[PDB]
Amino acid sequence: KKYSIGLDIGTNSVGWAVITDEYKVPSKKFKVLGNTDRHSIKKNLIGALLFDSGETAEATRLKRTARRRYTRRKNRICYLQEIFSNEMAKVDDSFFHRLEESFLVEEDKKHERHPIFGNIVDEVAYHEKYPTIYHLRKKLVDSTDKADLRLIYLALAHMIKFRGHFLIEGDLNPDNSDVDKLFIQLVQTYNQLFEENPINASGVDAKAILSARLSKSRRLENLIAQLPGEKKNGLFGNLIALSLGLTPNFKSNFDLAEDAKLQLSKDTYDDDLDNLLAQIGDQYADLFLAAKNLSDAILLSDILRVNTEITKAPLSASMIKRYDEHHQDLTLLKALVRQQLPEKYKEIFFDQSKNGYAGYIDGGASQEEFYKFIKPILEKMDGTEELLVKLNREDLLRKQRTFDNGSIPHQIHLGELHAILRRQEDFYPFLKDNREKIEKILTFRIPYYVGPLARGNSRFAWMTRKSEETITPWNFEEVVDKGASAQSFIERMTNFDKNLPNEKVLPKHSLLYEYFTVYNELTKVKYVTEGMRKPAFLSGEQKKAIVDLLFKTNRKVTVKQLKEDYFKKIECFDSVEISGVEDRFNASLGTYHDLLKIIKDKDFLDNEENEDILEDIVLTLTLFEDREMIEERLKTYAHLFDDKVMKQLKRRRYTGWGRLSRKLINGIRDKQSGKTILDFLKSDGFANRNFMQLIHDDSLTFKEDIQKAQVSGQGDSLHEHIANLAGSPAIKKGILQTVKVVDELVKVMGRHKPENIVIEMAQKNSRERMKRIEEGIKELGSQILKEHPVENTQLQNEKLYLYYLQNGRDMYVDQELDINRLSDYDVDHIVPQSFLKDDSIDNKVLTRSDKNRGKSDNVPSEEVVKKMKNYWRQLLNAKLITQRKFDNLTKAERGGLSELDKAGFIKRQLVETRQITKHVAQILDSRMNTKYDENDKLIREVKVITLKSKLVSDFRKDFQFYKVREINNYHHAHDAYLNAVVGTALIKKYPKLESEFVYGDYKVYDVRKMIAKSEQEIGKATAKYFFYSNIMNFFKTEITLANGEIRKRPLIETNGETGEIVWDKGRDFATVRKVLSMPQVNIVKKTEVQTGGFSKESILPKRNSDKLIARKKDWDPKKYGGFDSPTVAYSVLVVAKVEKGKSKKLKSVKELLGITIMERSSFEKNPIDFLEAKGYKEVKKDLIIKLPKYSLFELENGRKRMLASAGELQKGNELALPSKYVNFLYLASHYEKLKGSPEDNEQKQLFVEQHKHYLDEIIEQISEFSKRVILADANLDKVLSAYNKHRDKPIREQAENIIHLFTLTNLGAPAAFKYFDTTIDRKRYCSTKEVLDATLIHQSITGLYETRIDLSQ
DNA sequence: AAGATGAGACAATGGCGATTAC
RNA sequence: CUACUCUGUUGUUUUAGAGCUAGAAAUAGCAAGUUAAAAUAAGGCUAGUCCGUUAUCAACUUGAAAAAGUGGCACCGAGUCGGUGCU
DNA sequence: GTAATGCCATTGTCTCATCTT
C-alpha cells in the first residue's frame, strides 16, 4: 500500500498527515495497552503534535557568568583576608569570623552581635565618627596617623569588593577620561562619517558646558546654543542628549518607520543599539561608542564633584560632600514641612507605603519615584528654593550607593587603595611586603581569551596550564599558557561558513569582504545613455575605473556624485539613468579608509602583494580587544610601519563576523571558465551575474562545489545534524519532533517507507504605507491629502490605498477617479491570475472598468502603454510604484509576456528560497534513503518534496477550505494533509519538474521546453505542460482570464506522458472536504518535565508561612525570609498513608505531590526516603507514577484534562466544529476584506446573509460543548447573556467576537476573552482531586499508540 | 503636527494568600 | 542565527548603627534615616579562583549509562471515533 | 475545618491623551 506523508513544521506545533493514492486519510485500529477493558481504538492517520517553544541559552549564559562573577569576587575577599590573617589574629581573634556571620540573628550567632569591634560603645563611636564608609576612606587617604587594622581592612575590602568598571585600559589620563578630549573625538568621528556639511566646534568650551552644574535638558540646550548650524533635534544633538542621560529619538534623523529610542542607563541599550545599527549599517557603531565614552566622562565628572585638589581621594571627598548636602537638605525639608504643612508629615517620613522619604530610605521606592512624589509638595510649599533646582538636576537627597556608580572606573579605587597602603606602609610591615599583592587583587582581571580556569571538568573552558598549582592573581602570568590559551580561543570563536564547512569565516570588516560586497552591489547597476535606449550592465573596465576613482577616495558614494564625477568627467555622458540602486551604495570600504587614515600610505593599500598582511591585521584587530595580546600578535609587523601610526593602529578595534569565507569569495574556481566568484563579479562579459545567481545557476561549477561539500561537514548522529542547522532553537526542536514523528509513522505502516514526504515550514504596515503615500505626494506635488484628508486607520482599504497610490488618476484612462464611487470601480491585475497568483499591491491597479486593459489575455496592450508611459514614469520616479510594477506595466511595448517571464513565474511559485527548509529536507532524505547498488549511486526510494505555504493557502482560498486558527488545533494537521494532497498532485502531474521541489540530484530540465508557445493547447507530440504559467490551474474547473473568456479544463486531470489520473475534480474535492470534516484528529501535547529556575527570584521578607524556602541550609525562613513559589518539575501520584494527628490513624491516601525543580535530584536519588521525609508511610513503591506537565487524563462523557501542575489542570478537549460553520465564520469576518473578484465577492456576501442563522447555531455548538466538557457555567451564562445583548450588532462584528468566544473552549490553559465591551475572566481548574479516579492516557508522539491506565485503585 | 510622559490595559500562565461556602 | 568568554552598578534579604520623653500597658509627642557585613538560585564532587536555569524526556521490557526492542488487514460509516468480514 | 473562587512575576510594553515645542 503506497502512501505519502505531509508535514507542517512550526516552532510550537508539528502537523502531520498520511494520505493514500486516492488522497484519502487511512483509519486504522491500534492496540491499547494498560489495565482497562479497552483493548483497541480506531484512529485517523492525521494529527498534530503541540509543544512549548524551545528556549534560547541566553538567560542561562547570563546566570552562569553572574555566578562566576560572584564566586570570583568572594575569592578576592578571601585573598585579602588571607593577606590580613596573621596580623588580624594578633589584633583581633574573631574579626573576620564576626564579619562572615553578620547575617545570622543573635540567637544563632556564636560571637558578639557587633561586627567591627564587638562592643556597642566602640560601634557607636565608629558610626558617629564615620557615618559612611567613604568618611573612613577619605581619612585613611588623608591622615598620616596610625589607624586600626580592622578599619584598614574595611576600606581595602570595600574598594576590592566593588572595584569599578574596566572599560578604560591602562593608566587614567586626560586623553581617555576628560570630557573635552572625548568631545573632540566625538566630533571627529562625526565629521569623518559625513564630511559634507560637517560641524566645526573649535571655539566651544566643552568642559564649561558639559561639566556645569545644571539640569540635563538645560545643559543640552546650552550646548546647542553654542553651535548655530546644528539644532537639538539634529543627529549630533540627539547624540549629546543620549550622552547626557536623556531619551532621544533617532527616528526623524534616519526616517525610520518604527521609533527607535535609546537610553544609556537602561540595561537593554545594547541590543537596542544593535537593532538601530542593523537598520542604518555598522558605520555609525563607533559613533555611538564614542557617545558612550563621552557619557561615562560626563558621569565621572558628575560624581567627581570635589576637584579642588586639596584632598588625595576625589571620590570619597565627593561622597562626603554628598552626605553633608543630603543632611542639610533633609533637615531643611523637615523644618519647612513642619512649618508650612503640619498635616501629611507622617505620609512623608513614617508611612513608607506611598514613596515618601521613609519609602525612599526604608521602602522599595527609587530615586525617580521619590522625586516624582515630592515635586508637587515642594512646588506647593513656600521657601522651597535651593531644593527644586537640586530636584530637577537629579541631585537632591542623593544616596552614596546609586545607579550612577557604574560609570566610576577602577583606576580611582586603585588610586585610593594605593594611597591608603602608602600611608600605613611603615606602620604595618606586611602592607609594605604585600602592597603589589593587594594592588594586584584589585587590578587583576581574568582575560576574555583565557576563560574559566578549569581543570578538565568544564564544558566551556579551554585554557592551558604550564604548571599544576592553584591559579591566583599573582602567579597568573607564569601558570597560564597565554599563547596556547589564545590559540584555543581563536579555534573556538571561529565560526564556519554555512555555504562551505571546514573553512573559517572572514571578519565582517575584512578588506576582501568589503571588496566582495562592494562589487556585489555594483554589479546590479544598469545605465541608459542617449541613443542606445536599452539597459546595459557595467563592464569590467568600468567597474575597475569607478571603484579606483570613486570608492577609494570617499567613504560615501551617492548616485549624484557617481553620475557627475565619473560618467560626465571621464565617459563624457551628459544624461544617465540608474535603476539598480536607490540613493547611495549600502556597501562601503570602511576598513580601507580606516587604514588609509592610520598609516597615511595610499600606494601600500593597493599593492596586491600586501593583501595577506592587511587581512592578518584586520583579523587580529577583530578577534582581540586587549592591548597586550594585540601588541603580541602585531609585533611581527613593527618594522613595516613607522611606529607612530602603529600606536594608532593598536587603538583601533573591530567587532563582528561575516557569513562567507575566503575560499568561497576568491578560492573555488569554475573548471570551464577558470574564474572565481570575485573574478566573475569583476568580469562576466555582457550579462553580469550576482552572487545569489552564481549559487543558483547550475551552468557553472559553483553550485556543484557548494553542494558536494555540504555532506562533508555533517556528522554521524542526528543530534549533530540538528545542531549544525542555521535557525532558532525553537525550530530545531520542531525539526527533531518532525523527524521522530516520521519515524513513528513509518513504524505504524509496517516499516513501509512513504513514496513522498511533503514539507511545509509553517499598525506597522499602515505606518509604512502612510510614509510611502506622504513621500510620493510631497515629491509629486498634488495636494490630494488637503482636499481629502485621511489617517492611517482608513488606509487599510485596498481601493482607497490604490486610489492614493495612483495620484487619484485612472491607470488606463486619462481621467480622475471618483473618490466616493469606488464600489462601481474594479481592481485589475497587471499579470492575470491565470498566469501567476499575485494579489499584492505590487501587481494591482484601480480603474473604472477592466475592459480598458484591451482584448489580449496578456499584460495591457501597447495602445494604452504608449499613452500612459509618461505618467507611469512620473509615478515611478516618485516612488509611488516599484520598478518591477513599472516593468510589468510596460511589457507589451517589448512584445509582451515571454517564455523567460513565464519560466520565472513557475520558478517563483515552485522553488523554496529558505535554506533551512532545504537542510531539513536534506536530513529527512538522508535518514529515509540509505540503500545503494553495486556501484556508488544512492537509490532514492522516498522523495522529499518542499512546498511553499502560498500554494496551500491559495488552494484553501480558491476552493473554500478556509482556515480559522481560533476554533481548535486541527488546522495544523489539516495543513499537513493539504500539503500532502498538493505535493502529490504536483509530483504526479509534472514529474520533469522534480528538480524544483524534490530534494536530490535530478535532471535540470530547462523550463523553455515545457512552456507552450502561442497557445499550443498543451499538445502531446511535444511536451507542453502548460501555456498559462500558473501551476494550480488544473485543480480549477474553469479558468477566468483577464478579458472575461472562461476557459474549460477536463473533468478528470491526467498526466500526459504516463496516462495516470492525477486529479478527479468530483471525487477528490469531496474526499478533501470529507477529510477536513473528520472530528477525530490526533492532537497531542508533548509531556515535559519542567526545568529552569527553582522559584520566583524575589527574596521576600520573613513571614510565618511554610511556603517560604531557605536561601541557605541553616537560614530558617521564619527568621530570615527567602524564596517562595517554586516551579513543579513534575507531579508524582503516590499511594501511601499519613498520620491524622488525633491518633496514629494511617489513613490510606492517594494524591499528587509536586516535586519542585530544587527537590528533583533528591527525590530521584532515593524516592522512598524523600517521601518518608515528607510524612508519607508505607508507600506503595510499585504504584508511584511520574506525571510530567501536560499529562493527559480522561474523565466522564469524553471530558479531558491535562496536568498543569500538582494542584491545577488545563482543558484537554478539542472542539470539532463542522466545516460549514468554519467557512461561515471566515466569510462573515472577512466581509469587507474578501480580496476577490466582484461577482465572487457578491456570492460570498449573499451566502453569509442567507446563512446568518449559523451565528446562533455556532453559539449553540459552543454552549453544548461547554456544558459537556468545560464546566464553566458562570462564564457560559455571561457569554450567552452578552450574545443576546449584542444580537442587534452587524453580522461581521458578531462573527469577529465569536472568534474571541472560542478561547473559552480552546485546548490548554484557560484564558480571558472579550465579547464586545464585556470581558470574561478565566475560570481555572485549581483542584487535582478528580484526576485521581480518572483514566490516565500515555501517548506516543503521534498519539496513535496509547496506554490507558484506570487510576481507580 | 510631532515628540515625550503618564496611565490603563495587554502580554501569560501558575503559585500564594485571602476569601467564601458547605 | 545561534553559541561563548571577561567585567560592573543597582536591587532584595537578615544583622549592626543604643532611639529619647511620658503611660500598668495600649497608644501618643519628637529625634534619626544616606552606610556597612554576608548571601544572591538550595547546593554538587570532580575540590576547580570548576559546575548548577539551554538542549533532551509518553508507556512497557533489557541495561549504571549512550541505546536497542514491543502494537494485524479490508469494507460501511463519522461528534473527538463506532460497527462488520477475514486473520 | 476543608475545598473551591485577585495580585504578583526580570515591574515589560503598547496605545491614547495631554502638554510643549
Residue numbers in the entry: 3 to 764, 774 to 1364
The authors write:
The basis for Cas9’s utility is its DNA recognition mechanism, which involves base-pairing of one DNA strand with 20 nucleotides of the guide RNA to form an R-loop. The guide RNA’s recognition sequence, or “spacer,” can be chosen to match a desired DNA target, enabling programmable site-specific DNA selection and cutting. The search process that Cas9 uses to comb through the genome and locate rare target sites requires local unwinding to expose DNA nucleotides for RNA hybridization, but it does not rely on an external energy source such as ATP hydrolysis. The described linear- and bent-DNA conformations present a new model for Cas9 function in which open-protein Cas9:sgRNA first associates with the PAM on linear DNA, then engages a switch to the closed-protein state to bend the DNA and expose its PAM-adjacent nucleobases for interrogation.
Remarkably, in the other state, Cas9’s two lobes pinch the DNA into a V shape whose helical arms meet at the site of R-loop initiation, employing a bending mode that underwinds the DNA duplex. The CCR (candidate complementarity region), on the other hand, is tilted at a 50° angle to the PAM-containing helix and leans against the REC lobe, which has risen into the same “closed” position as in the Cas9:sgRNA crystal structure. Compared to the high-resolution cryo-EM density contributed by the PAM-containing duplex, CCR density is poorly resolved, reflecting conformational heterogeneity; however, even at low resolution, its distinct helical shape enabled construction of an atomic model that adheres to B-form DNA constraints between the PAM-distal tip and position +3 of the CCR. Therefore, in the bent-DNA conformation, two helical arms join at an underwound hinge whose target-strand nucleotides are heterogeneously positioned.
